[PDB]
Design an enzyme around this catalytic site. Sequence first.
Site, short mmCIF file in Angstrom:
data_model
loop_
_atom_site.label_atom_id
_atom_site.label_comp_id
_atom_site.label_asym_id
_atom_site.label_seq_id
_atom_site.Cartn_x
_atom_site.Cartn_y
_atom_site.Cartn_z
N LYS A 199 -34.06 -51.99 -28.07
CA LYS A 199 -33.11 -52.62 -28.67
C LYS A 199 -33.83 -53.20 -30.13
O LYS A 199 -33.87 -53.86 -30.16
CB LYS A 199 -31.93 -53.43 -28.61
N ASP B 227 -17.02 -59.60 -23.46
CA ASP B 227 -16.32 -58.44 -23.70
C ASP B 227 -16.40 -57.18 -23.36
O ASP B 227 -17.22 -56.22 -22.96
CB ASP B 227 -17.61 -58.49 -25.24
N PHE C 250 -26.96 -55.19 -36.39
CA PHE C 250 -28.35 -55.59 -37.17
C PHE C 250 -29.51 -54.37 -37.17
O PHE C 250 -30.41 -54.52 -37.41
CB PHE C 250 -28.55 -56.92 -36.43
N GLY C 251 -28.60 -53.55 -35.73
CA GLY C 251 -29.97 -52.30 -35.89
C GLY C 251 -29.29 -51.21 -35.16
O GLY C 251 -28.62 -51.16 -34.87
N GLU C 252 -30.82 -50.82 -34.89
CA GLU C 252 -30.40 -49.78 -33.20
C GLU C 252 -31.44 -49.67 -32.47
O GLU C 252 -32.19 -50.05 -32.02
CB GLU C 252 -30.28 -48.21 -34.17
N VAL C 253 -30.36 -49.15 -31.19
CA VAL C 253 -31.20 -48.64 -30.32
C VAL C 253 -31.95 -47.28 -29.71
O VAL C 253 -31.07 -46.20 -30.41
CB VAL C 253 -30.16 -48.80 -28.15
#
Lengths: 618, 61, 338
Positions: free
Chosen positions: A189, A286, A171-174
Amino acid sequence: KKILLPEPSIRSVMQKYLEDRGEVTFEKIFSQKLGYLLFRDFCLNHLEEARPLVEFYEEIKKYEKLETEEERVARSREIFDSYIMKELLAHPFSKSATEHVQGHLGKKQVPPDLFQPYIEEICQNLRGDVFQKFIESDKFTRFCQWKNVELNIHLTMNDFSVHRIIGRGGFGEVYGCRKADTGKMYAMKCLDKKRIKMKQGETLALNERIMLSLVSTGDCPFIVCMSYAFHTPDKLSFILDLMNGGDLHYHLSQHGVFSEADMRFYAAEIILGLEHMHNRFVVYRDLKPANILLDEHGHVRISDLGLACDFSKKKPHASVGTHGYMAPEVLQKGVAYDSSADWFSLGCMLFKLLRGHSPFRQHKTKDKHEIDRMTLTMAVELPDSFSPELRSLLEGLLQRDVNRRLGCLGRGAQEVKESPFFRSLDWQMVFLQKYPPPLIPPREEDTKGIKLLDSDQELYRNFPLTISERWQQEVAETVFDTINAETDRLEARKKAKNKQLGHEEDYALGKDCIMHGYMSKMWQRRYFYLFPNRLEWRGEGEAPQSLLTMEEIQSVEETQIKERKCLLLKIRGGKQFILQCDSDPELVQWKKELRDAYREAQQLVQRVPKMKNKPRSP
Amino acid sequence: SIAQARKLVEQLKMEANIDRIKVSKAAADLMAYCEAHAKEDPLLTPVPASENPFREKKFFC
Amino acid sequence: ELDQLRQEAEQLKNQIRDARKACADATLSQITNNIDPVGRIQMRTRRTLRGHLAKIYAMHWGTDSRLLVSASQDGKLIIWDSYTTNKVHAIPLRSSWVMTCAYAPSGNYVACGGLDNICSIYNLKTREGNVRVSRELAGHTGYLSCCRFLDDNQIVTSSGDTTCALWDIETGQQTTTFTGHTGDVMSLSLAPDTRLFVSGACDASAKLWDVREGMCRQTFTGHESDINAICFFPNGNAFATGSDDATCRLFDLRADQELMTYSHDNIICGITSVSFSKSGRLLLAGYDDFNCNVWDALKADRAGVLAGHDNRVSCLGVTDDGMAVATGSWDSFLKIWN
Ligand SMILES: O=C(N[C@@H]1CNCCC[C@H]1OC(=O)c1cc(O)c(C(=O)c2c(O)cccc2C(=O)O)c(O)c1)c1ccc(O)cc1
Ligand SMILES: [Mg+2]
């Protein structure tokens, strides 16, 4: 750019806000970093009776932090010789308390508990008059200045100076970024809102926010924590700890497998981390080395909390996780589970650090259903080169039966800690990040067929959040000391300027004023005074030559003017009076205190024949 | 109560035990007061403007 | 036994009615029929006193016919110099709910009070100059409606608790209490000699009290609604009442009955205040229609109107030297008329 504290007058409003939520108690304030700091300033520099008490509190606190037994035997007697003979001649301590303390001391046994009896009696003496003297004092005024800020935190991209990318995702980038407010280094984030709607990740993204929230309290060194959460018209955003060392799946690639001695270190730090999540009723689900991150010193933290899950109110049962590291009860159709899952994952991950793959991954297979079938059926064949105490630990963790697995029998994290494998480690020293780390790091247009509705936006309405102790700690370790001094200079200067101006004392004192402070009429900023029967206001110079009575007020509502929340007073004459405020606490309180004021006023008048409205028209 | 009712009778006897003059004499005496003092009431017998604070008076104590 | 005394309670009520009817040989309007009318009195507003930030509930002239006190919804008493508009003192009160005020005859002290249920006395000239509170008077269990001094050390208050009381200001206790009214007491007026005073209540009755002896000499019914205000005639043998029923009434003590009723049909709102002129010829009454009407007391004609407030005339007062009339209003202004 920099933080500008509000004026001392904020107290009138803030105090009433805090008192309504029972937050003006010794316990509530003392147990806060900034609360604490302003409190001790008061006692140390402004009340000679409280000084030795706090001095002694802080001395015992240094003792609590001492590494080993031989350092304590030293400090223990070192402590009892000096201050104590001032305190016993003062404010004595109880026999009851000195009995236990001297009992341990005489025997030369010295735990951190040693002085805990003295802690309690110090509080007893701090929380009485001494606290109420603090509430009256200028330092509680200063606390109220700081708390105002905390409860007015609206974040946007302007607040952060974004630097480099350090992680892509779905959904996106850090990113990595500096909060311009204080100059604290963080990671941002940014999940894109158009990407989220395209993948239906609605509960998935809003889950993380709640999960990050639950784990961020406590001040833990082994989980990537959140300090803030906020959103712009087209993006969500998390402010998280910064880790510049890369993930353990990347370093496994460059280092190859690790020794037992090296895997131990990571397992230790990862364990404590997991314990923290479990005590707060969160199952991570996870755990893989890709989700474990390194700081520039080499120490580690669990990170990716999207798949995490609350298990307090009801135990989950889905097949959530990555296929190499999922416990048998997670995979099975309708079987429920709790912290049991994360321990099985620990085995799988620990194994991979030692031999380069999951134990249920073979011939480098890429068949999820085959890998899931090894988990449920295959007995984990362990190498010979492995030690005995390692074989001990892993076949405990990878034990299919939940009732026969380490970390599930009742004591949770403690069963694994006291395993033979960690026999060498002082576990406090792990938590103190004092053991040397083994590895020290070296120095788009797919979503244009989808529009953002204002129905979608309501799902993230209560997205924004600020973790208090985190913000307070940020401030504490950066701008707090200096900004106190700066606003101390202003407040002293204004008073010195007003002393030259033949200071007229407060217009509120002496009367029955409910509360008072700045607000903006209609924009014209003016100082208000709310009385039981009226609401006056003045400009910067003279006494109030304007007002509005309580009996005129039909209703007090909240409405929007250019996307800022305001108060809409409806006057009896059909007219309307609009008020803006400088902070959310202020808006909440005015609304309340006005609703309470006019309703009280309007009933009192009803009784009075001389003040009420009699008939006129036929 | 009976205390609340006996209080009343005692009072009502008290009010009945006053003596009364005739409204003709009563009115006559009021009208005698008005006529007598009408010279002095400045809302009926106005004074010079300079002697009236709220008109043209200049000097004050 | 309960019935037994409720028959005598109305047998005596009827003994009184017929007692009074034997005096009703003529009427004031008949006796006065002969005198020249006062004629139109067109008083113009000569001052406007501007300072209060909200409604004015109560005003009171000082004996020197120059200074007056006013009390207001804005939480302040102000003492004005009418001759010049100047404020002598802006006193900020400790309670916002004031309803009344009163100037000393001496002029050394003012008083006020309200839903606080206390009559606070302020000292207008301390040994410095800063005006301060010199005494509270707690005792009433209802709102203070009105109060007046006899001298520096004696005051008389009336309350919505349904009673009146005479205080000793030094000790701060009640010398005498005046139980009798069965509804909230609203106004009072001292007889010029002070030995008497009268009150007016929401029971629709006024009572003549025996200040020193501490009891009700006479009760005067006739009104149909809450009596809001009351005033003595300069010679002390008659008084006047203001009520929500839209009428004033002149009552004579020695005749023990109503003498006169002032009320035009066109006046349908209530009277909030009443005062006589120096001679007693004019009766001035404040109304909820924003006006003060001037009545020929003796003939019951309306001699004129004081019209110039944007809201209820809440109070009024004639100077001891009859030079001026003051009106105070919900428009927040006082005005001095003549
Ligand atoms: O978590 C970090 N880095 C991780 C390491 N794990 C391996 C993957 C790379 C990187 O993760 C991301 O960059 C990332 C970006 C995202 O937009 C998302 C998601 O949008 C996302 C989510 O929030 C929850 C569930 C799933 C996803 C997804 O993208 O599939 C994510 O999970 C990771 C990290 C954290 C703090 C810090 O200072 C530096 C780095
Ligand atoms: Mg399951």
